[PDB]
Amino acid sequence: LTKIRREFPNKKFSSTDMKKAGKLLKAEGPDAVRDFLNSCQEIIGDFKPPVKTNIVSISRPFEEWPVSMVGRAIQEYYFSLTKEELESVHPGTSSEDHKSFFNITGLSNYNYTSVQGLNLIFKNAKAIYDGTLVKANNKNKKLEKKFNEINHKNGHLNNPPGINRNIYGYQGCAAKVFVPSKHKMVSLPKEYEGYNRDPNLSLAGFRNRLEIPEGEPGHVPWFQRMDIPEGQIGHVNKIQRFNFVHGKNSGKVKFSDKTGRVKRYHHSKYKDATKPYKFLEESKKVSALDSILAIITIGDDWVVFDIRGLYRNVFYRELAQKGLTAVQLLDLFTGDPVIDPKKGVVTFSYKEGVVPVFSQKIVPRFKSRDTLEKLTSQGPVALLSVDLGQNEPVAARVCSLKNINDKITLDNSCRISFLDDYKKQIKDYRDSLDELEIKIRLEAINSLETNQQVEIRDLDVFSADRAKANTVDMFDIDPNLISWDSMSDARVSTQISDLYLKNGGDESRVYFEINNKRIKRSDYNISQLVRPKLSDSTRKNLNDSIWKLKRTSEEYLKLSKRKLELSRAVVNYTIRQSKLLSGINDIVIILEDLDVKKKFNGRGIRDIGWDNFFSSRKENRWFIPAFHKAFSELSSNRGLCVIEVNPAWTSATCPDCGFCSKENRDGINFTCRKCGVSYHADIDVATLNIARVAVLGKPMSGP
DNA sequence: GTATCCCATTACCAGCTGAATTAC
DNA sequence: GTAATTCAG
RNA sequence: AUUGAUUGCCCAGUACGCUGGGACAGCUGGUAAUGGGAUACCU
Ligand code: NI
Ligand SMILES: [Zn+2]
């Protein structure tokens, strides 16, 4: 069938058509398959984003489901076998094959005979088992090839995979809109009483938030509606306006220009504990009755879940026609959702042709010149060069590349400057990490007994003074001689060590012996040597309390997410600005190929001074890996063209002169040694050189 | 400067994420 | 009327 | 029927009644790495 497909290069075929093409080819013949492929409609995309839904109620715990018990059993049996044994035991797709499988194997199904369901289990388990062999083979083949070039110039799985607890739905258990009339055995919690929703009616029930009365859930407070005109719905009284205190920085409602998501129930906004939500029960009941419920029935077990997750996601991607119904909403997604028992969610995937995105891979460095040649052949293309750095989190420059042979110049191109808001967000993220650590430690300290508490609190406040006293004692020196407020640990400083070297100080006391060579004790090393230590029992208690609090803390996940949305927001803003500056919307993103696995994660930062040696180091990890992944994943998640070029000798070569030297870079300032022209090291030189490398076919020469 | 625990995160790479028709 | 067959790069 | 698109998740404000934004390719598994904090070595 592949040869027949190869004669349609311009037309893209969906997976359904290819699977349907095989049936036609085996049924009628090549004339039929060509005729069918001629009549196939062109697909607008092939990416299938997932949507997550909240599970409402379940008949049994997911561990007790027949599908879960058989799935875990089959997975364990497969992962306990060898390659030769698995090939002979893996069954076919027929019903008789499954029964034969359970007969030859001592393993027994738990009254689960669904052919489609067991077909998914066997197919997925073998794929996971074969994944380890593929993973090892590619690693070995790459390692052997890499070592060969440098030199010239099994049984039971060693690392068996874990059990995949996800339940994969099939056509037999396809999601249907829940009606209590047709599901008598299905129960529901108390808030889900009197549930009623006709599947075929439109879900387009839209209402204005400004009409809610002042004593009802969702009401927009008066002080947030002071800019609404008199003739509009949300206008506030003139007498009541005099009670508005200014400067409170409370939000202002967007009564006319608001676009995007509409929030209906706000019980989840009040996730604090100082004051519980006033309408918690009322909003819970109302949201329960306004839920859109779908049901998956596997055997005698059922899952009821919200498909409001589908609805919001569909309106986000602008994929719904007028008057969409629950049945149509479920038709927008494939009828094979995945159930996650641990997270308590049911995941839906879009159908292939719904989302107009063609996922693409990263263009390699040697294909940079070829890729732009095709892009410039079919109209123009906008170059987007992004440089990742520490002082500048990302520097972006947009180039309108009408012809591949055109010259790229700072006057020709435009620079996309990093916003101050994103710098503030990065600083706030780091501060939130530091405050989370401080709060966790403080709560753990407060969890201890009074004697341990007072001991720990006493140690922290006078930790620096006692250490300084120990230094001035063991090292006889004037405390005023050493500048304690300029002492540092990141840079090797020996202010105390050098002073002790005078007056015939002992070499052994000031120097530390190491296997490689003798190393002089740094000032931070001196402070840590004489730093007072807690008692063993108190230290153990504090460590146990800290670990217990951290294990159950839910803030680390929130911070990791917050970083993810921060990086993605920066990337989205950069893409939007690239579209805005150069009117053409065919953006190609040029990245520098970075090994973000290591050597790009920043260290912690410590404030200058001796007193800061005894406090926890502040978080200062760089955002380079986050921005690299967020930019690189644009190709797979959104279909954009992303190119990774060789980063060597970028920002070190003069944009005007070919001279290359390491001395050209002085940090955030670029000055060439041959010519006096000066530019910004990252914003101007780096982006321009990256764009030139992308347009050209070879990495730049150095030194 | 090195070494061992503890907590958190990640990077890389290996999977996975139907349905029309027929059978009965 | 739910469940088994049958396609794929 | 709405200016706006009903659940969920993240951030900042709040009079705690909400507003203004943000992400929307996700999951499972294994390995490795990094960051932070203690402790051990040494005069
Ligand atoms: Ni750079
Ligand atoms: Zn020059």
Closest-approach nucleotide to residue A49, Cα vs C1': D25
Using the structure, give the distance in angstroms from the CA atom of A310 to the C1' atom of D7, rounded to a whole number. Answer: 9
Structure-block tokens of residue A470: 């120990």
Does at least one atom of strand C sit less than 7 Å from the CB of A4?
Answer: no
> DSSP 3-state assignment of A346?
strand
CA distances from A518 to A53, A445, A495, A510 (A): 61, 39, 18, 11
* A45 contacts A352 by C-beta, under 8 angstroms: yes
- Break positions in chain A: residue before each gap, C to N over 2.5 angstroms: 153
* A132 and A34 inside one domain: no
> DSSP 3-state assignment of A337?
coil
Which of A447, A435, A432 lies closest to A549, judged by CA? A447
> DSSP 3-state assignment of A676?
coil
* A519 contacts A511 by C-beta, under 8 angstroms: yes
Ligand minimally distant from the alpha carbon of residue A395: 1
Structure-block tokens of residue A504: 């015939």
* Residues of chain A by 3-state class (helix, strand, coil), percent to 5: 45, 10, 45
Does at least one atom of strand C sit less than 7 Å from the CB of A22?
Answer: yes
Does at least one atom of strand B sit less than 7 Å from the CB of A664?
Answer: no
A194 part of a folded domain: no
- The span from the CA of A504 to the CA of A476, in Å, is 11
Using the structure, give the distance in angstroms from the CA atom of A86 to the C1' atom of B21, rounded to a whole number. Answer: 32
Closest-approach nucleotide to residue A2, Cα vs C1': C9
* A307 contacts A326 by C-beta, under 8 angstroms: yes
A320 part of a folded domain: no
* A571 and A505 inside one domain: no
- The span from the CA of A509 to the CA of A464, in Å, is 21
Domain boundary among A138, A165, A192: A165
Q: Residue A294 phi/psi, 5° resolution?
A: -120, 155
The one-letter code for the residue type at A481 is L
Which segments of A486-632 are extended strands (E)?
A: 511-512, 519-520, 587-592
A503 part of a folded domain: yes
Experimental method: cryo-EM
Using the structure, give the distance in angstroms from the CA atom of A286 to the C1' atom of D7, rounded to a whole number. Answer: 12
- The span from the CA of A681 to the CA of A661, in Å, is 13
- The span from the CA of A654 to the CA of A665, in Å, is 10
Q: Which residue shows structure tokens 């591949």?
A: A404
Q: Residue A152 phi/psi, 5° resolution?
A: -65, -40
> DSSP 3-state assignment of A401?
strand
- The span from the CA of A332 to the CA of A351, in Å, is 7
The one-letter code for the residue type at A82 is T
Ligand minimally distant from the alpha carbon of residue A687: 1
DSSP string, A37-50: HHHPPPPS-----E
Structure-block tokens of residue A561: 């997410």
- Residue A76 has a CB neighbour count (10 Å cut-off) of 14
* A394 contacts A629 by C-beta, under 8 angstroms: no
Q: State the burial class of residue A230 (Cβ atoms within 10 Å of its Cβ: 0-12, 13-18, 19+).
A: exposed
Using the structure, give the distance in angstroms from the CA atom of A325 to the C1' atom of C5, rounded to a whole number. Answer: 31
Q: Which residue shows structure tokens 């080819």?
A: A25
Burial A571-583 (b: 16+ CB within 10 A, else e): bebbbebbbebbe
* A266 contacts A280 by C-beta, under 8 angstroms: no
Structure-block tokens of residue A373: 């040649």
> DSSP 3-state assignment of A481?
coil
Structure-block tokens of residue A7: 């004669």
**Helices within A350-393 (DSSP H only):** 368-377
CA of A684 to the centre of ligand 2 (A): 14
The β-bridge relationship of strands A678-680 and A511-512 is: unpaired
Ligand minimally distant from the alpha carbon of residue A393: 1
Which segments of A545-671 are extended strands (E)?
A: 587-592, 641-645, 669-671
A122 part of a folded domain: yes
Q: Residue A512 phi/psi, 5° resolution?
A: -110, 130
A179 part of a folded domain: no
Q: Which residue shows structure tokens 């926890």?
A: A616
Those residues with Cβ within 8 angstroms of residue A532's Cβ, 6 or more apart along the chain or in another chain: A459, A463, A466, A467, A470
Q: State the burial class of residue A381 (Cβ atoms within 10 Å of its Cβ: 0-12, 13-18, 19+).
A: buried
* A418 contacts A393 by C-beta, under 8 angstroms: yes
* A373 and A387 inside one domain: yes
* A450 and A521 inside one domain: yes
> DSSP 3-state assignment of A253?
coil
Q: What torsion, rounded to 10 degrees, do the Cα atoms A11, A334, A50, A44 define?
A: 20
| DSSP code, position A219 | P
Q: Which residue shows structure tokens 């967020």?
A: A630
CA of A129 to the centre of ligand 1 (A): 41
- The span from the CA of A668 to the CA of A685, in Å, is 11
Structure-block tokens of residue A668: 């955030």
Which of A286, A346, A291 lies closest to A178, judged by CA? A291
* A494 and A568 inside one domain: no
Residue A670's DSSP bridge partners are A665, A679
Where in the sequence is the domain holding A34, given as residue range(s)?
A: 2-39
Helices (H) and strands (E) in chain A, counts: 22, 16
SS3 string of A109-147? CCCCCCHHHHHHHHHHHHHHHHHHHHHHHHHHHHHHHHH
Those residues with Cβ within 8 angstroms of residue A83's Cβ, 6 or more apart along the chain or in another chain: A133, A155
- The span from the CA of A52 to the CA of A305, in Å, is 10
Which of A157, A161, A160 lies closest to A83, judged by CA? A157
| DSSP code, position A565 | H
Residue A338's DSSP bridge partners are A168, A347
* A610 contacts A487 by C-beta, under 8 angstroms: yes
A296 part of a folded domain: no
Q: Residue A399 phi/psi, 5° resolution?
A: -125, 125
> DSSP 3-state assignment of A15?
helix
- The span from the CA of A507 to the CA of A130, in Å, is 61
Dihedral over Cα of A613, A616, A620, A625: its sign: positive
Using the structure, give the distance in angstroms from the CA atom of A549 to the C1' atom of B6, rounded to a whole number. Answer: 12
Structure-block tokens of residue A454: 């007072």
* A458 and A534 inside one domain: yes
Burial A590-616 (b: 16+ CB within 10 A, else e): bbbbbebeeebeeeeebeeebbbbbee
The one-letter code for the residue type at A546 is I
Does at least one atom of strand C sit less than 7 Å from the CB of A21?
Answer: yes
* A528 contacts A467 by C-beta, under 8 angstroms: no
Q: Strand A50-58: give its sheet, edge to edge.
A: A167-168, A338-340, A345-349, A50-58, A301-306, A293-298, A176-177
- The span from the CA of A104 to the CA of A127, in Å, is 21
- The span from the CA of A313 to the CA of A294, in Å, is 16
Q: Domain count for chain A, please give it.
A: 5
Which segments of A479-544 are extended strands (E)?
A: 511-512, 519-520
Planar angle of CA A626, A261, A200, nearest 5 degrees = 120
Q: Which helix (H) or strand (E) holds A340?
A: strand A338-340
Those residues with Cβ within 8 angstroms of residue A693's Cβ, 6 or more apart along the chain or in another chain: A368, A645, A646, A650, A699, A700
| DSSP code, position A684 | I
CA distances from A184 to A174, A178, A179, A600 (A): 18, 11, 9, 59
Does at least one atom of strand B sit less than 7 Å from the CB of A631?
Answer: no
* A574 and A535 inside one domain: no
- The span from the CA of A357 to the CA of A370, in Å, is 23
CA distances from A394 to A3, A559, A581, A669 (A): 46, 21, 17, 16
The one-letter code for the residue type at A426 is I
- The span from the CA of A449 to the CA of A430, in Å, is 31
Does at least one atom of strand D sit less than 7 Å from the CB of A284?
Answer: no
Structure-block tokens of residue A510: 């000031």
Does at least one atom of strand C sit less than 7 Å from the CB of A114?
Answer: yes
* A539 and A439 inside one domain: yes
* A532 and A588 inside one domain: no
A520 part of a folded domain: yes
Q: What torsion, rounded to 10 degrees, do the Cα atoms A437, A440, A441, A445 define?
A: 170
- Residue A17 has a CB neighbour count (10 Å cut-off) of 20
* A479 and A546 inside one domain: yes
Dihedral over Cα of A104, A110, A114, A119: its sign: negative
Q: State the burial class of residue A435 (Cβ atoms within 10 Å of its Cβ: 0-12, 13-18, 19+).
A: exposed
A176 part of a folded domain: no
CA of A418 to the centre of ligand 1 (A): 14
> DSSP 3-state assignment of A660?
strand
Q: State the burial class of residue A427 (Cβ atoms within 10 Å of its Cβ: 0-12, 13-18, 19+).
A: exposed
The one-letter code for the residue type at A618 is K
Q: Strand A641-645: give its sheet, edge to edge.
A: A414-416, A394-401, A381-388, A587-592, A641-645
| DSSP code, position A681 | I
Dihedral over Cα of A567, A568, A573, A578: its sign: positive
* A682 contacts A647 by C-beta, under 8 angstroms: no
- The span from the CA of A703 to the CA of A694, in Å, is 20
* A32 contacts A58 by C-beta, under 8 angstroms: no
The one-letter code for the residue type at A265 is Y
* A509 and A580 inside one domain: no
The CATH number of the domain where A665 resides is what?
A: 3.30.420
* A502 and A569 inside one domain: no
